Design a protein around this motif. Structure first.
Motif, PDB file in Angstrom:
ATOM      1  N   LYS A   1      54.666  75.018 -22.841  1.00  0.00           N
ATOM      2  CA  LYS A   1      55.397  74.467 -21.703  1.00  0.00           C
ATOM      3  C   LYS A   1      54.457  74.446 -20.504  1.00  0.00           C
ATOM      4  O   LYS A   1      54.434  73.487 -19.735  1.00  0.00           O
ATOM      5  CB  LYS A   1      56.605  75.349 -21.386  1.00  0.00           C
ATOM      6  CG  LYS A   1      57.639  74.732 -20.451  1.00  0.00           C
ATOM      7  CD  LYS A   1      58.657  75.792 -20.033  1.00  0.00           C
ATOM      8  CE  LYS A   1      60.041  75.214 -19.772  1.00  0.00           C
ATOM      9  NZ  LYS A   1      60.077  74.263 -18.630  1.00  0.00           N
TER      10      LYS A   1
ATOM     11  N   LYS B   1      52.200  71.554 -20.698  1.00  0.00           N
ATOM     12  CA  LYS B   1      52.874  70.305 -20.348  1.00  0.00           C
ATOM     13  C   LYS B   1      53.059  70.171 -18.828  1.00  0.00           C
ATOM     14  O   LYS B   1      52.949  69.071 -18.286  1.00  0.00           O
ATOM     15  CB  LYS B   1      54.223  70.205 -21.076  1.00  0.00           C
ATOM     16  CG  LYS B   1      54.875  68.820 -21.032  1.00  0.00           C
ATOM     17  CD  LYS B   1      56.171  68.762 -21.845  1.00  0.00           C
ATOM     18  CE  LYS B   1      56.778  67.356 -21.842  1.00  0.00           C
ATOM     19  NZ  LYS B   1      57.953  67.242 -22.754  1.00  0.00           N
ATOM     20  N   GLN B   2      53.329  71.285 -18.145  1.00  0.00           N
ATOM     21  CA  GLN B   2      53.497  71.268 -16.691  1.00  0.00           C
ATOM     22  C   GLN B   2      52.172  70.874 -16.056  1.00  0.00           C
ATOM     23  O   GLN B   2      52.133  70.029 -15.165  1.00  0.00           O
ATOM     24  CB  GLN B   2      53.946  72.637 -16.167  1.00  0.00           C
ATOM     25  CG  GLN B   2      55.419  72.955 -16.428  1.00  0.00           C
ATOM     26  CD  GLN B   2      55.815  74.348 -15.958  1.00  0.00           C
ATOM     27  OE1 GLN B   2      55.057  75.021 -15.253  1.00  0.00           O
ATOM     28  NE2 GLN B   2      57.006  74.789 -16.354  1.00  0.00           N
ATOM     29  N   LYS B   3      51.088  71.464 -16.556  1.00  0.00           N
ATOM     30  CA  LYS B   3      49.741  71.174 -16.071  1.00  0.00           C
ATOM     31  C   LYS B   3      49.447  69.686 -16.202  1.00  0.00           C
ATOM     32  O   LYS B   3      49.092  69.032 -15.225  1.00  0.00           O
ATOM     33  CB  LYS B   3      48.710  71.981 -16.866  1.00  0.00           C
ATOM     34  CG  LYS B   3      47.251  71.616 -16.613  1.00  0.00           C
ATOM     35  CD  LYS B   3      46.324  72.590 -17.337  1.00  0.00           C
ATOM     36  CE  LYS B   3      44.886  72.099 -17.387  1.00  0.00           C
ATOM     37  NZ  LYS B   3      44.760  70.905 -18.267  1.00  0.00           N
ATOM     38  N   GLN B   4      49.651  69.155 -17.402  1.00  0.00           N
ATOM     39  CA  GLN B   4      49.405  67.747 -17.680  1.00  0.00           C
ATOM     40  C   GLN B   4      50.266  66.841 -16.804  1.00  0.00           C
ATOM     41  O   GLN B   4      49.773  65.852 -16.258  1.00  0.00           O
ATOM     42  CB  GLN B   4      49.657  67.451 -19.162  1.00  0.00           C
ATOM     43  CG  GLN B   4      49.139  66.096 -19.642  1.00  0.00           C
ATOM     44  CD  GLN B   4      50.210  65.012 -19.694  1.00  0.00           C
ATOM     45  OE1 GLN B   4      51.274  65.122 -19.076  1.00  0.00           O
ATOM     46  NE2 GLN B   4      49.927  63.954 -20.442  1.00  0.00           N
ATOM     47  N   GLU B   5      51.542  67.197 -16.648  1.00  0.00           N
ATOM     48  CA  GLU B   5      52.467  66.400 -15.842  1.00  0.00           C
ATOM     49  C   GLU B   5      52.118  66.437 -14.365  1.00  0.00           C
ATOM     50  O   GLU B   5      52.351  65.473 -13.646  1.00  0.00           O
ATOM     51  CB  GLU B   5      53.912  66.851 -16.061  1.00  0.00           C
ATOM     52  CG  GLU B   5      54.478  66.478 -17.430  1.00  0.00           C
ATOM     53  CD  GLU B   5      55.938  66.890 -17.616  1.00  0.00           C
ATOM     54  OE1 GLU B   5      56.353  67.936 -17.064  1.00  0.00           O
ATOM     55  OE2 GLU B   5      56.673  66.168 -18.329  1.00  0.00           O
ATOM     56  N   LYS B   6      51.523  67.542 -13.928  1.00  0.00           N
ATOM     57  CA  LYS B   6      51.127  67.691 -12.537  1.00  0.00           C
ATOM     58  C   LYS B   6      49.911  66.813 -12.289  1.00  0.00           C
ATOM     59  O   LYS B   6      49.803  66.182 -11.243  1.00  0.00           O
ATOM     60  CB  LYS B   6      50.817  69.159 -12.213  1.00  0.00           C
ATOM     61  CG  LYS B   6      50.550  69.447 -10.733  1.00  0.00           C
ATOM     62  CD  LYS B   6      51.698  68.997  -9.827  1.00  0.00           C
ATOM     63  CE  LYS B   6      52.965  69.793 -10.069  1.00  0.00           C
ATOM     64  NZ  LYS B   6      54.074  69.327  -9.208  1.00  0.00           N
ATOM     65  N   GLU B   7      49.014  66.754 -13.269  1.00  0.00           N
ATOM     66  CA  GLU B   7      47.815  65.938 -13.154  1.00  0.00           C
ATOM     67  C   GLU B   7      48.221  64.477 -13.059  1.00  0.00           C
ATOM     68  O   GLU B   7      47.690  63.728 -12.239  1.00  0.00           O
ATOM     69  CB  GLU B   7      46.920  66.123 -14.378  1.00  0.00           C
ATOM     70  CG  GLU B   7      46.274  67.486 -14.511  1.00  0.00           C
ATOM     71  CD  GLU B   7      45.610  67.677 -15.867  1.00  0.00           C
ATOM     72  OE1 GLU B   7      44.817  66.804 -16.281  1.00  0.00           O
ATOM     73  OE2 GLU B   7      45.892  68.696 -16.529  1.00  0.00           O
ATOM     74  N   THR B   8      49.164  64.079 -13.908  1.00  0.00           N
ATOM     75  CA  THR B   8      49.650  62.705 -13.935  1.00  0.00           C
ATOM     76  C   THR B   8      50.349  62.359 -12.619  1.00  0.00           C
ATOM     77  O   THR B   8      50.187  61.256 -12.094  1.00  0.00           O
ATOM     78  CB  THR B   8      50.615  62.471 -15.130  1.00  0.00           C
ATOM     79  OG1 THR B   8      49.915  62.669 -16.365  1.00  0.00           O
ATOM     80  CG2 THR B   8      51.158  61.056 -15.116  1.00  0.00           C
ATOM     81  N   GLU B   9      51.091  63.322 -12.074  1.00  0.00           N
ATOM     82  CA  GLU B   9      51.816  63.132 -10.818  1.00  0.00           C
ATOM     83  C   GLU B   9      50.841  62.872  -9.670  1.00  0.00           C
ATOM     84  O   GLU B   9      51.093  62.020  -8.818  1.00  0.00           O
ATOM     85  CB  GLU B   9      52.679  64.365 -10.517  1.00  0.00           C
ATOM     86  CG  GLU B   9      53.563  64.265  -9.269  1.00  0.00           C
ATOM     87  CD  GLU B   9      54.392  65.525  -9.012  1.00  0.00           C
ATOM     88  OE1 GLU B   9      54.281  66.500  -9.789  1.00  0.00           O
ATOM     89  OE2 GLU B   9      55.155  65.536  -8.019  1.00  0.00           O
TER      90      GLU B   9
ATOM     91  N   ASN C   1      49.203  59.444 -10.140  1.00  0.00           N
ATOM     92  CA  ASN C   1      50.163  58.402  -9.803  1.00  0.00           C
ATOM     93  C   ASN C   1      50.229  58.190  -8.295  1.00  0.00           C
ATOM     94  O   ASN C   1      50.342  57.061  -7.825  1.00  0.00           O
ATOM     95  CB  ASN C   1      51.545  58.741 -10.361  1.00  0.00           C
ATOM     96  CG  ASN C   1      51.655  58.459 -11.847  1.00  0.00           C
ATOM     97  OD1 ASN C   1      50.877  57.688 -12.404  1.00  0.00           O
ATOM     98  ND2 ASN C   1      52.635  59.070 -12.493  1.00  0.00           N
TER      99      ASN C   1
END
Lengths: 679, 679
Positions: free
Chosen positions: B632, B635-643, B646
């Motif tokens: 998890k 996934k937070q790390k990856q989603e933060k990078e994507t955020e 963006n």
């Protein structure tokens, strides 16, 4: 030049309507047969000189849907309303006011007609008027009995705050429903006529236009509940709500009595029929001789002096207050989880009763007047109260306790059981010179000075018996009185104490309160009150111990398993790393680790809040795995075990006496800090 | 039978003192030469019939320490005070009232003498009286100019809440210091004489006895600050405080306007000189045609109708309000950290100004009158405002914008730049029958009906020109008017729109406001206002992006190191178990792990809040070490990078237009939901 209305037979035109004084007259439009009778009933009081009456509608057979022009013409013809116009004054009209009686949708119709055709009419100061039946009635008993009414809640609320402290009052049973409606209407017309007389003279002005007996007993129950205190804490629900609010807010600093009030009121569903909240707060803090033996709240401001019995207290907004340092030693916080908090409208309020370590109803006493019941219990010596508590704990005979007032210095004598005579003090300091250094406990200085002034400068039907009088009151009482040799001799004959009114009785024959069960009771002795309290307090000390021990035990288990969990991971007997959730939950369960819920209760075995979680383990910080932190966890565990053992070594009475001792220390401090403040 | 005082030469005995009407007379005791002159100045107004004057003291050379018997005798002899007595009425005295003028410790001395010797005196209703200089003066400008005064703050506060909404008012400069003292005294005696006349007729009663020019400019600055709005948000500090309070409370449900007010006032140091808080709240929520184009607060109750221009709004206590669903799309929360919150008395209050996504001063407009400055800006179409914002973003020419009112349906025409003529609508629906379905935007229905009634039933000096009129107003305007053929012909000659007053002007020649820098400015065009706003908003969108990206980056690093920390322990590259604290802190530092403070800022390298801690690592739960939890974290790390990525793909204008689009959607909804509510 009375303009006369000839086309309306049902009209009973006010004699002065249509004349120069028409602006003073009032037209009463009625709807229904019963409204006509009432209008007439009211008119029998005020007369037909300045009041007219007209049946707008008679009786309605059809049903009410959510103005007939014939009705519009009637109103216009009678009122003298001519044409579509913006009115500013009612000087061109036959009548100056209009009243509507409905027996309630037609008033709106008339209002629409008036606004739609005659603009400024309804906006004129006292033009429209309506019969309103009061919602609340209050029985004023001191300055004099008169039953003042209030037609809408807000009027009651304002009087309650800004005026209730001047009169000894209570609410009376009032529905203002059927048979009493006739008199209600007369009272309305009577009050209305007074207002109009003054309104028109000044041409400053308030405006009128801005059973099942079960409810009788329902009212008598609430009154006694508001009026008689509970024997356990000596509080009435109102005072209890205040204290509860103070404990609830966790107050460290002071607050204006005006500030604390709305807090207690919102937080405790303080009833409207109750006494003024600010007044209740001030009563709890008053510290002059004659008030509280132990004031639970601190009087940081002018909360009233001995001179008028606190009746000269400043406004709520000008005075501050906080909890007395000693209060929490009297009301022990460890007892809080034991109480039964009353549930009102999804909100939990104050307890049915608090359970102080010593009988507060004996410490400060109580006084109140309800319906069918009344009570008076003088204040007693807390030092003596504690002594009797200990006598009970040690199966020893109780010692009799007599009234006692903090900071007071006269003398009290028992003439017979439950009857005392309280004396002030008067000594002769020279020839014909008697000085008064003490007065009976609840005798206020104003009462004595006025008695001295009356006998000094005689009134009609009583001639001068005192020669000279002089007040030198610093913080203590001191009336220096000089008499004539003949009067000094008659003072010896009548008596120095009797003549200067330095004797007042104390009666213990009406010590009433609610028992632990909530049923009113009359106690025949002080020991009877102390004993009833004792057994309940004794019981709750066992309850406290049990409540505390059960939880400490739970903590002992929590720490035990926390230490086990950490230790096992430390020594690689258990691994959490990259292991699935369900795998660890099952592994912990198989090893015998109990679950813990929010309240800290453990649940062993296989199955929420009913079972708990392993959050106390896996929810621990990674810090816990380290050295110092783990050694700290070991020390907490050991200290918790010792804490439990220390508690289990004590009995219910051992804990009670520990509190009693802690109170004794703080009370001696309260006493010096109080004598130092007002001296 | 005038009892005459012969032993006091300095006494100017009231002519009617000592007679039957002595209870009506007033004795003015003076202290100091200047107090004597003032008493006399006041007496020149009221006369010597019911007022006496006596110099108690002349001038004091010695110094004031914190009553001479000669003074006691003077007061007694003149007042007719005989012996030590409890007074209840002032019928046995030569004078009915006593006034003291000091130029302030002697009043206390007199009070002590009176209480100590004559009990009920000071407790009598209007006996004692004193000269009090007003603290606040208010300029009432609508119902008529008159400068009502207030002698103590509370009187001001009550009038402000219960009366301020009836008059267009402001506070005037008043010290009531030196040269103006003479008139102040006359006004006092004048008002006092009025009260006594009515007090004694009714024998209901209010009681009197219950420079450095820098401060002039200091007052003019505050007035303009309270009166003229800021160009960025179109708010005046008062309205801004309210909105800020609503954002601050995180309100989900509605509140009484009486409930919300004290919250805003306590939370925002709402000045006393400001307008009524409840009134400010109601203004922000009014939704009748002519009020707000976009009301930021919701009118859940009677907040005023089109008929009187909201002047018929219910009381604060009877009306509820909440934030408009659209408000937070206008005032974007992502902009909150960017604002400069004003610091007052150790409390941070509302921002200097808010920065809505579109110019609110153009959407709703503004109106106010200050000292030396005044402003009026009509409402404009938000749809058109957004179009012009986009023109600016795309370097395209701006299109001219003319006034526009929500829900209104007449027509507006430009006669010349900055000057318009607003029309209602009147059509002939038959022979001699003209119906009015629309009136100019800010023309209230009451104004037209009264004009119709006046011409229908002619007034003195103007004869009937209308034959019949009829209102059928449902929720829309509809006056059915019938005329005589001769008047219908004169209506064609004078003009249907002019004769029925269906034309009103709009002036853009006084569009004043404070610029982004806080300096008053007059804007010569609407585009001038929009452009000034634009560049500041554009800038802050870059600021928002930068503020957001910097933090997202910090989170990317936090997650990166959290994943590293966990992963290293998982693979036994790092052990925390039983390792000393300092050993782990050093080990983490040597491995290159940064510290993180409370705000989430990282600090790399060797050295609090200035450096941070490793709490983001060791403070993680043991749960983090497990499988699912670690995945998890990945996934937070990856989603933060994507955020972050963006966000960095977007420009300041891309984000602005995203908000603009989100507003457009909500605004169309606001529009239908508003037309549906009042229609």
């Amino acid at each position: 030049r009375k303009s006369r209305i000839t086309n309306y037979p049902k009209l009973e035109d006010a004699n002065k309507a249509g004349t120069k004084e028409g602006y003073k007259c009032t037209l009463v439009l009625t709807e229904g047969d019963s409204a006509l009778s009432l209008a007439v009933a009211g008119l029998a009081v005020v007369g037909r000189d300045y009041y007219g009456c007209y049946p707008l509608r008679g009786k309605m057979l059809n049903v009410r849907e959510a103005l007939k022009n014939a009705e519009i013409q009637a109103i216009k013809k009678i009122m003298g309303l001519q044409h579509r116009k913006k009115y500013e004054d009612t000087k061109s009209l036959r009548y100056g006011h209009l009243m509507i009686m409905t027996d309630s949708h037609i008033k709106g119709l008339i209002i629409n007609f008036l606004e739609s055709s005659f603009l400024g009419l309804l906006d004129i100061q006292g033009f429209l008027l309506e019969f309103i039946t009061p919602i609340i009635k209050v029985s004023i008993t001191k300055p004099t009995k008169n039953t003042i009414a209030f037609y809408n809640m807000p009027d009651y609320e304002k009087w309650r705050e800004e005026e209730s402290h001047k009169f000894t009052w209570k609410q009376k049973y009032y529905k203002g429903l059927g048979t009493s409606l006739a008199q209600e209407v007369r009272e309305y017309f009577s009050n209305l006529d007074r207002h109009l007389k003054i309104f028109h003279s000044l041409q400053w002005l308030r405006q009128y236009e801005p059973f099942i007996n079960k409810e009788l007993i329902l009212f008598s129950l609430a009154d006694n509940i508001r009026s008689i205190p509970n024997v356990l804490d000596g509080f009435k629900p109102g005072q209890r709500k205040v204290l509860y609010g103070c404990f609830k807010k966790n107050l460290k600093s002071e607050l204006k009595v005006a500030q604390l009030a709305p807090y207690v009121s919102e937080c405790t569903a303080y009833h409207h029929g109750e006494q003024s909240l600010a007044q209740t707060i001030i009563g709890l803090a008053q510290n002059f001789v004659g008030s509280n033996n132990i004031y639970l709240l601190l009087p940081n401001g002018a909360f009233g002096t001995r001179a008028t019995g606190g009746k000269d207290a400043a406004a709520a907004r000008y005075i501050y207050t906080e909890l007395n340092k000693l209060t929490r030693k009297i009301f022990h916080p460890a007892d809080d989880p034991l109480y039964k908090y009353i549930q009102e409208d999804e909100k939990t309020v104050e307890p049915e009763w608090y359970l102080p370590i010593l009988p507060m109803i004996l410490v400060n006493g109580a006084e109140g007047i309800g319906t069918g019941w009344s009570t008076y219990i003088p204040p007693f010596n807390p030092l003596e109260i504690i002594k009797n508590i200990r006598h009970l704990m040690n199966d020893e005979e109780l010692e009799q306790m007599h009234p006692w007032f903090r900071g007071w210095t006269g003398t009290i004598e028992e003439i017979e059981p439950l009857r005392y005579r309280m004396y002030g003090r008067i000594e002769q300091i020279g020839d014909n010179v008697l000085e008064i250094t003490e007065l009976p406990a609840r005798t206020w200085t104003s009462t004595i000075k006025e008695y001295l002034l009356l006998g000094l400068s005689g009134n009609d039907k009583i001639k001068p018996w005192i020669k000279d009088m002089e007040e030198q009151h610093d913080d203590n009482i001191k009336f220096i009185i000089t008499l004539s040799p003949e009067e000094m001799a008659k003072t010896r004959k009548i008596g120095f104490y009797e003549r200067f009114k330095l004797i007042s009785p104390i009666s213990l024959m009406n010590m009433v309160a609610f028992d632990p069960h909530g049923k009113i009771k009359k106690y025949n002795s002080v020991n009877e009150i102390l004993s009833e309290f004792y057994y309940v307090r004794l019981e709750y000390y066992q309850k406290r111990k049990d409540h505390m021990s059960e939880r400490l035990q739970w903590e002992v288990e929590k720490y035990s398993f926390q230490v086990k969990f950490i230790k096992m991971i430390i020594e690689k007997e258990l691994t959490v790393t990259n292991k699935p959730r369900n795998a660890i939950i099952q592994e912990l369960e198989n090893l015998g680790f109990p679950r813990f819920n929010k309240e800290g209760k453990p649940y062993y075995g296989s199955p929420e809040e009913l079972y708990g979680t392993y959050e106390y383990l896996l929810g621990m910080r990674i810090w816990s795995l380290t050295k110092e932190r783990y050694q700290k966890l070991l020390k907490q565990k050991q200290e918790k075990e010792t804490e439990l053992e220390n508690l289990l070594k004590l009995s219910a009475k051992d804990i009670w006496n520990t509190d009693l001792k802690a109170f004794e220390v703080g009370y001696q401090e309260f006493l010096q800090r109080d004598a130092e403040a007002r001296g």
